[PDB]
């Protein structure tokens, strides 16, 4: 059955709760973003109202084949009414179309659900600053002080300079970027833009990108692999064997590969700065691991919560074991004692 952390008190709303069949009482199902864990259980067979951003609606329609009658897209940064209750969707700074939702309850309680998010100080001057928030449903993916990472912009700058140098040294090198879902598009779009190229990709991936409301998209991406010097492949193919295999497929049009694996955190964040990063190399193929995160670091999460000063926190990630919950509650109390709320 649907856990309490996916229910919004004193409404018939749920959030990211599609895997439990019909939820008793639920009149509106919200979807924060188009990642399989969150949408799990949604298909062309679903027949209840789904509320979401315009981008998330495009994906539901075109990728999952959810029937149009059941998709209720809402604009961002706009007060809307859903089944008699005031809501606002805000940018989550996660993947394309990902939202946080602000719910103004009839009794006067205010609840923020972050979805998945990468906390940023620009969120301190949104509609959130206008009133007190009593309860916070929080993306606790990286809620532990070891989880540090560079800014998105540091990582992109590094990727850009690396790619530009390699292709100027060898104009027959191919650049490859690994991917498994939506998110982290700036990695491959920034590399292509410094090389004067479109990004080549499969038909399924191109169809996905065509849903994302990216300006001038037709000028940036193609299904003609031949004509492009940046290619997208599934993350699972980003290894020496998969990359040599792909190089054979391209018809001797390239004689070297440089590949990027955008990952979350891995243990080497605790010493290395982005400027120290060096690739793994076997022959004419080099692979760079780059920590491009679309989740809050510990410090980013802490700052946001200490600003917001919620009366209660409800974790939405790593809640499956008592040890994790206990650990997280300890950090929430520290933050509250330091900041005086
Ligand atoms: Ni996500």
From Swiss-Prot:
Domain of life: Eukaryota
Organism per entry: Homo sapiens
Function of the protein: May be required for DNA interstrand cross-link repair. Also required for checkpoint mediated cell cycle arrest in early prophase in response to mitotic spindle poisons. Possesses beta-lactamase activity, catalyzing the hydrolysis of penicillin G and nitrocefin. Exhibits no activity towards other beta-lactam antibiotic classes including cephalosporins (cefotaxime) and carbapenems (imipenem).
Signal sequence, renumbered to the chain: none
Subcellular location(s) of the protein: Nucleus
GO biological process, one term: cell division
GO molecular function: 5'-3' DNA exonuclease activity; beta-lactamase activity; damaged DNA binding; zinc ion binding
Oligomeric and partner information: Binds constitutively to TP53BP1. Binds CDC27, which is itself a component of the anaphase promoting complex (APC). Binds PIAS1.
Covalent S-S links between cysteines: none
Keywords for this protein: Cell cycle, Cell division, DNA damage, DNA repair, Hydrolase, Isopeptide bond, Metal-binding, Mitosis, Nucleus, Phosphoprotein, Ubl conjugation, Zinc, Zinc-finger
Name of this chain's protein: DNA cross-link repair 1A protein
A cellular component term, taken from the record's GO annotations: fibrillar center
Tissues expressed in: Expressed in brain, heart, kidney, liver, pancreas, placenta and skeletal muscle.
Family that this chain belongs to: Belongs to the DNA repair metallo-beta-lactamase (DRMBL) family.
Induction annotation: During mitosis. The mRNA encoding this protein contains an internal ribosome entry site (IRES) in its 5'-UTR. This 5'-UTR generally suppresses translation while specifically promoting expression during mitosis, when cap-dependent translation may be impaired.
């Amino acid at each position: 059955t649907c856990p309490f952390y996916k229910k919004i008190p004193g409404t018939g709303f749920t959030v990211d709760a599609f895997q439990y069949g019909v939820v008793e009482g639920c009149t509106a199902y919200f979807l924060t973003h188009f990642h399989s864990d969150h949408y799990a259980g949604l298909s062309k067979h679903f027949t209840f109202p789904v509320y979401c951003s315009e981008i998330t609606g495009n994906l539901l329609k075109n990728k999952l084949h959810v029937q149009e009658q059941y998709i209720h897209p809402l604009p961002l940064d706009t007060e809307c009414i859903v089944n008699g209750v005031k809501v606002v969707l805000l940018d989550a700074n996660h993947c394309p179309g990902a939202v946080m939702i602000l719910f103004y309850l009839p009794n006067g309680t205010v609840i923020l659900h972050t979805g998945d998010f990468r906390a940023d100080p620009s969120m301190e001057r949104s509609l959130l600053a206008d009133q007190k928030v009593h309860m916070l449903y929080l993306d606790t993916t990286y809620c532990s002080p070891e989880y540090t990472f560079p800014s998105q912009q540091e990582v992109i700058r590094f990727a850009i300079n690396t790619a530009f140098e390699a292709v100027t040294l060898n104009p027959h090198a191919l650049v490859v970027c690994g991917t498994y879902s939506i998110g982290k598009e700036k990695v491959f779009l920034a590399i292509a833009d410094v090389l004067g190229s479109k990004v080549g990709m499969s038909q399924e991936k191109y169809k996905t990108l065509q849903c994302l409301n990216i300006p001038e998209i037709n000028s940036l991406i193609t299904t003609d692999m031949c004509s492009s010097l940046v290619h997208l492949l599934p993350m699972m193919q980003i290894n020496f064997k998969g990359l040599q295999s792909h190089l054979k497929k391209c018809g001797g049009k390239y004689n070297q590969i440089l590949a990027f694996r955008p990952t979350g955190w891995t243990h080497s964040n605790k010493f290395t700065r982005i400027a120290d990063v060096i690739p793994q190399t076997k022959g004419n193929i080099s692979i760079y691991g780059i920590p491009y995160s679309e989740h809050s670091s510990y410090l980013e999460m802490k700052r946001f919560v200490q600003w917001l000063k919620p009366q209660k926190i409800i974790p939405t990630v790593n809640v499956g074991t008592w040890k994790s919950r206990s650990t997280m509650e300890k950090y929430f109390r520290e933050w509250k004692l330091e900041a005086g709320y």
